[PDB]
Scaffold this motif. Structure first.
Motif, PDB file in Angstrom:
ATOM      1  N   UNK A 101     -28.668 -80.010 -59.105  1.00  0.00           N
ATOM      2  CA  UNK A 101     -27.309 -80.435 -59.455  1.00  0.00           C
ATOM      3  C   UNK A 101     -26.798 -79.689 -60.655  1.00  0.00           C
ATOM      4  N   UNK A 146     -24.233 -79.733 -55.307  1.00  0.00           N
ATOM      5  CA  UNK A 146     -25.518 -80.357 -54.984  1.00  0.00           C
ATOM      6  C   UNK A 146     -26.229 -79.681 -53.803  1.00  0.00           C
ATOM      7  N   UNK A 196     -29.561 -79.931 -63.725  1.00  0.00           N
ATOM      8  CA  UNK A 196     -30.579 -80.963 -63.665  1.00  0.00           C
ATOM      9  C   UNK A 196     -31.174 -81.089 -62.261  1.00  0.00           C
ATOM     10  N   UNK A 235     -33.886 -83.489 -59.778  1.00  0.00           N
ATOM     11  CA  UNK A 235     -34.759 -84.585 -59.379  1.00  0.00           C
ATOM     12  C   UNK A 235     -35.633 -84.152 -58.247  1.00  0.00           C
ATOM     13  N   UNK A 286     -37.739 -85.455 -56.586  1.00  0.00           N
ATOM     14  CA  UNK A 286     -37.852 -86.416 -55.490  1.00  0.00           C
ATOM     15  C   UNK A 286     -37.109 -87.685 -55.763  1.00  0.00           C
ATOM     16  N   UNK A 287     -35.957 -87.830 -55.129  1.00  0.00           N
ATOM     17  CA  UNK A 287     -35.205 -89.048 -55.288  1.00  0.00           C
ATOM     18  C   UNK A 287     -35.850 -90.146 -54.494  1.00  0.00           C
ATOM     19  N   UNK A 288     -35.305 -91.342 -54.656  1.00  0.00           N
ATOM     20  CA  UNK A 288     -35.832 -92.533 -54.028  1.00  0.00           C
ATOM     21  C   UNK A 288     -34.878 -92.749 -52.909  1.00  0.00           C
ATOM     22  N   UNK A 329     -31.499 -94.004 -53.516  1.00  0.00           N
ATOM     23  CA  UNK A 329     -30.495 -93.067 -53.986  1.00  0.00           C
ATOM     24  C   UNK A 329     -29.902 -92.140 -52.928  1.00  0.00           C
TER      25      UNK A 329
END
Lengths: 95, 95, 95, 95, 95, 95
Positions: free
Chosen positions: E8, E46, E76, E78, E80-82, E85
């Protein structure tokens, strides 16, 4: 009417926009073809006519809102746009 | 009712807008024809009437919100717009 | 319920808005009739009731968000709007 | 899951919002019920759970974005909203 | 492709966004899954991929727009998002 | 026409955008494929062509609005985007 010059005045607030919009049409023979909301507070107003007519409109429109609300942003004339550009120019505003 | 003058007050916040909107209609005989969201935080309120009626409305509306929330932006009267301009003026607000 | 006074709190952020919204309804007997997004970051919340009820709501709602997020903008009561103005007031918020 | 406490974090940027959103759900057992765009740049994220679960979520979510992009705006918990207020709370976000 | 890390980059302007968007996909094997307009001027871009791929993307994307227009806001990853999300993450952008 | 380079100019105001938009198409052989409103006041304009053509467009477009209204934000050329990125690029603007 059917000139194709373009008059444009950009404002901060709709209220200055509407005085502009009106002093312009009172000034010369222009057609109000658009009032757009740009986000962030600027509002533009846009009118078409012949060149003389549209030169006058904007002058008159300028010194009419310059002290209304949050005021005037720009004021500018393209005596003849390119057809490529009429694809982002509105025909008539949305009431 | 059916006057055609225009009263306009521009604010920073809807909350000042709504006091304006209400003090105006309490003031004289105007019709609230629009409340618009301009983006960027300004909100305008717009009412129609005869000239006397609409002169009073705005005065009353002005000094009513000038200290509500983030306050007053402009306050302005076009005693008679041009038909070209009624194409961006709403007839009645969207509830 | 069916009072018609109006409570209004304007904020900078939805998060302060939602605490306001909730402390208000916890305070007195009001109806949350609207949460609006004004653009530019202000959010307003709006509730109806009787006059006593709506006076309390807003007080409670004020000192509840004044330090939440970016804070409180205004906080204001129209004990009785004019029917002209209910044409911009929502009936119930959009979920 | 089905707790009803509310966790809320308000940011300046979606990018801080999404880290918040994710660190929160990684933290405790919450449900991400909303991500809203407030205009003006703030974005809020909203999750439901039991009270313990939602207390943790927000703490974790706070110190996760506080330095991401333009940062954290607020971070706040209503352990129990009033049903009046659930009429502005989303059920599940719009993907 | 089908990695699930997340890259992102948040910008001020679409123009920096689009250079970012492009330098990123030129960098590693990512999928541009979204370009969103957050209001207030920030725009986010993204992309999804494997972890290595998405680490590189963002680095490259960062130092590509940092001086384009009004510039970079955040940048930034992540890894591995959940799944909670992914309910606010787009699948593919709107053209 | 059918080049695929990209010219982009970002402005503060639509009025500078429209001069840009027009000076660009007057400059070289480009296609105006988009005018977008980013929120917060920036407006971008976007044109496609061959590389020479699009290099010229932007130069001309730059020094044409740099003093119109609130002015120029960026001005930038991607001689060849990646197909991943054409999924956020418009084909033709919305009139």
């Amino acid at each position: 009417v059917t000139g194709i010059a373009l008059g444009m005045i950009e404002t901060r607030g709709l209220v200055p926009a509407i005085e502009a919009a009106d002093a312009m049409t009172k000034a010369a023979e222009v057609r109000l073809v658009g009032r757009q909301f740009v986000g962030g507070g600027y509002v533009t107003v846009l009118v078409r006519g012949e060149t003389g007519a549209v030169n006058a409109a904007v002058r008159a429109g300028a010194d009419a809102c310059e002290r209304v609300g949050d005021g005037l942003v720009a004021a500018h004339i393209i005596a003849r746009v390119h057809s490529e550009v009429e694809n982002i120019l509105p025909k008539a505003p949305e009431a």
